[PDB]
Amino acid sequence: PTRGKLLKRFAQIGPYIREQQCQESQFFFDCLAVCVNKKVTPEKREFWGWWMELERNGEQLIYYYQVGLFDKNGDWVNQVISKKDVIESIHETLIRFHDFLQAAVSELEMTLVPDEKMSNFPLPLK
């Protein structure tokens, strides 16, 4: 599969992919799952969520998810509020997305492989 077709097919999954942040053989996804605080002003608004780097190595796509905060400056940081309701919300968006991603990957006849750093991922996949 061409990089252009990968991008198109990954775009079909939903608003996760961030084309602008995708490199030659790396694709970037994220998900704003839970507003930190809705009472705040637009300029200070932040989200708990996840982001994911996907490295292409031939027929392999190697995934590394991290969980954390998307801050008011547009940066992801790997710290998260220690609230069960928030962490569950993030987890459910990640599970749903990954299931779309695997289905997409089978349909492109490729393989989905966890990065070695997934050993330190704090929640499970499906």
UniProtKB/TrEMBL annotation:
Residues 93-116 are annotated as: Essential for activity. GO terms for biological process: positive regulation of DNA-templated transcription. InterPro entries: Tscrpt_reg_Crl, Tscrpt_reg_Crl_sf. Pfam families: Crl. Its main location: cytoplasm. It is found in: Cytoplasm. Gene3D superfamilies: Sigma factor-binding protein Crl monomer. Keywords: Activator, Cytoplasm, Transcription, Transcription regulation. It comes from the Bacteria. GO terms for cellular component: cytoplasm. The keyword Cell membrane does not apply. The keyword Transcription applies. Belongs to the Crl family. Binds to the sigma-S subunit of RNA polymerase, activating expression of sigma-S-regulated genes. Stimulates RNA polymerase holoenzyme formation and may bind to several other sigma factors, such as sigma-70 and sigma-32. This is Sigma factor-binding protein Crl. It comes from Proteus mirabilis (strain HI4320). The gene is crl.
